[PDB]
């Protein structure tokens, strides 16, 4: 089922005008929350701006993230030295098959996973000396472990359930992709065929090529977001010059009732 996940980052020497600490919050693949240490306020994103919330919703998100801001910045002092450092955290929860919450609490230092929070013991830990140093500093801070436990075991699933109830339609959004299949010349004797899927949601999507109705492979491709949180994808196949018209592309996506055949332009 659907995850609520906070992506937290601190940097020890932010570029001027940029935040030392910022957070994005995600309900599955769409962002609902933004926070940075320069504004110091948690804010809704996209359609979640229009969500009907409890009267204290966003002030409590702000309260929690200001606390995590202080912790992340304390982590650099525990390491000492010139740095620079990047500290990231992935904190959140998802509801499990029997309608209970499953927590996530992992951290990375300079792009490398190095620490987690153990919810059974209420302690941060990891193998590297940087993990031991930061964990000890956090562990020695009054109520820090307690607030981390509450955040993951109570606040997160409560928020997730509230958004499932108040924003169900936002989460069930199904926008089918606009499809195009086009060929361009390549090296001598070859063309590149590209099947492209525009402005769709959710991100799960399959593109396949057929040659005279027979399976011709997935091709090679990529995918990415648009500014509104919908998505874009393409996949490309190298084919012999003059043979392009024998090919089509098939797309599977939840916004369509059936797989859709896309013919060359």
């Amino acid at each position: 089922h659907l995850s609520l996940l906070y992506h937290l980052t601190a940097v020890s020497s932010p570029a001027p005008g940029t935040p030392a600490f910022w957070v994005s919050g995600w309900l599955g693949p769409q962002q609902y929350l933004s926070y940075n240490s320069l504004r110091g306020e948690a804010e809704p994103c996209g359609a979640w701006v229009w969500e009907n919330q409890v009267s204290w919703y966003w002030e409590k998100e702000t309260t929690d993230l200001r606390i995590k801001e202080k912790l992340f910045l304390e982590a650099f002092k525990a390491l000492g030295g010139k740095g620079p450092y990047t500290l990231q955290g992935l904190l959140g929860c998802e509801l499990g098959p029997d309608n209970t919450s499953v927590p996530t609490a992992k951290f990375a230092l300079n792009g490398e996973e190095f620490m987690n929070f153990d919810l059974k013991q209420g302690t941060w830990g990891g193998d590297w000396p940087e993990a031991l140093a930061i964990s000890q500093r956090w562990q020695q801070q009054d109520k820090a472990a307690n607030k981390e436990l509450t955040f993951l075991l109570f606040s997160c699933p409560h928020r997730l359930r509230e958004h499932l109830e108040r924003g169900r339609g936002n989460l069930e959004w199904k926008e089918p992709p606009s499809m195009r299949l086009k060929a361009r010349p390549s090296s001598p004797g070859f063309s590149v065929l590209t099947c492209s899927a525009f402005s769709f949601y959710p991100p799960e999507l399959q593109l396949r090529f057929l040659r005279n109705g027979l399976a011709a492979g997935t091709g090679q491709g990529d995918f990415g977001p648009n500014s509104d949180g919908s998505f874009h994808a393409s996949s490309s196949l190298t084919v012999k010059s003059g043979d392009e018209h024998h090919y089509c592309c098939i797309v599977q996506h939840a916004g369509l009732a059936q797989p859709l055949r896309v013919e060359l332009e």
Binding site: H7, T9, N110, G111, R180, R184, T194, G224, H232
Partner: protein, 99 residues
């Protein structure tokens, strides 16, 4: 650790000459998070460019979307220019309208 950015350039909607649209430059998979991105129109830096929040994927690598409103034409060429510490010089990726 350092990771070099992957760069993708595509429009929000299928490109149609004379129809308003958005051009995206999606930069992902990079570390550390400091990155510089410009959209270019026939080589000239575009002034009115917005960007999403710097976020990161399950493998901790960062990603970012830059976008600008534009109206494609037959002859105008667009590109994305990216600088990052992993790059010995700025990388320029041309917009392929098919992509």
């Amino acid at each position: 650790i350092q990771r070099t950015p992957k760069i993708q350039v595509y429009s929000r909607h299928p490109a149609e000459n004379g129809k308003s649209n958005f051009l995206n430059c999606y930069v992902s998979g990079f570390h550390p998070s400091d990155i510089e991105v410009d959209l270019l129109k026939n080589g000239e830096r575009i002034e009115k460019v917005e960007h999403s929040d710097l976020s990161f994927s399950k493998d901790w690598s960062f990603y970012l979307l830059y976008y600008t409103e534009f109206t494609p034409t037959e002859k105008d060429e667009y590109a994305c220019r990216v600088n990052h510490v992993t790059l010995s010089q700025p990388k320029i990726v041309k917009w392929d309208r098919d992509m």
